[model samples]
Target: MHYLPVAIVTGATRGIGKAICQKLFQKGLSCIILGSTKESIERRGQLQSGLSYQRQCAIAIDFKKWPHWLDYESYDGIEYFKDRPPLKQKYSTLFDPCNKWSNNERRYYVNLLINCAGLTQESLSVRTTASQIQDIMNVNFMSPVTMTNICIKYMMKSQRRWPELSGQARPTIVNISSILHSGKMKVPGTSVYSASKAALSRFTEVLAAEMEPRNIRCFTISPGLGTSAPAEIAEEVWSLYSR
Candidate 1:
């Protein structure tokens, strides 16, 4: 049997994540919001009463002081709970894989996975530190890539498990990317950040191809010059997904 779809939103405490969550809630989607800290959860909660839906909830995983580029390894696949052992736990924390929902359940019911988490700043490529480069790669590029990787498995597994439920299609993955990824133009001071974004854009292209057969649609929304998108952009993304 199908259930009300789930939507997993990353970086939901601020900027695009907040706006997207607002829009999704309007459509009656219960969200699993990922923030960098508990304080961020409270911050996002402040906006909850204004949301279109009332049942919204958020979990804060401290990512404070972590720059835009976080690596795939930083995610431990659901072992963050204090009561759990290292190897025998399901991943439900921000730093781990989300194994909360089964592949079939998530694939059959989850409407979308919105990757609204990202980073932006200015730094000259030559002057960028090795540490800075690593951070940028991890946050803007690697983290989303890894997060998407985990989500896609659930999507594919879901499709495989219940092919006749819909007999039509699987859900979608919407990646909120940045315009800085384009090397055609230079944002003089933000080279590392730009490269990381560019890498994500490329990753999306390859990933989209990889996931097409499973009926999981992947697309990237490249927003420019700001952390948060205009409400119009949020509407556009939701509309795109609904279509």
Candidate 2:
């Protein structure tokens, strides 16, 4: 507790994010923060919290409205959200146009961020709305990219960022990706999801190289179809980080 690194697992309420959260807690990460749609929070709050409460607290935050100044990438264990809203909800007005058009404030220090938010609208490219495309891109590609940029800021300053008065492990970033991306893998009936995942994969490759020489590792954890919870994915990530 005196010197544990925090990990931010976005979309920490569902599939992979939940898996990752569980894993981080087992590894004794500083904190396990959860992010998801507001509706998901309202509906699955108890389930999400209960699942990880023993290992780490499962907290909720809207990914689209993430505060600006917080940089958990400077911590040892922090999770992040990185996917589209689930099919059940028609809309997430919390991510409406205005906020996307506005500025955000940084809230916490970050050391690791997982991009677990993404979506696949069951429509042809032509049938897709511009807004839909925007949302998909924002959650899948743009958000990860934004997180990457922020992480490097502290990663580059890792020595300076972590005060000697409060020594902590070096910070690194892990972007959760999907192998279902058409360009990498072929999962029929998941075109939009594939495309978004593909975008995320490409972003990670380019960003990883940009974040070198800082004693930090920026990479992607691509997961296949699994019935596992977010805690499982959380563990998988920590396993990779240890290597």
Compared with the true structure, what per-residue lDDT tens digits does model 1 show for residues 1-243? 334466778877678777888788777665667766544455534334443322334554433234332332332222122233323222344323323433454431455787777655566778778877766666676667777876777666655666654654258888887777784667678777777777777888888898777667888878876443557667877887888
TM-score of 1: 0.72
User: Global CA lDDT of candidate 2, please?
Assistant: 0.54
Name the runs in model 1 displaced over 4 angstroms: 44-55, 62-109, 160-169, 226-229
Candidate maximizing lDDT:
1
In candidate 2 the C-alpha lDDT for residue 4 amounts to 34
**For model 2, what is the error of residue 177's alpha carbon versus the real structure, in angstroms, after optimal superposition?**
1.4
* Candidate 2 worst ten-residue window by lDDT: 90-99
> Model-by-model lDDT, in order?
0.62, 0.54
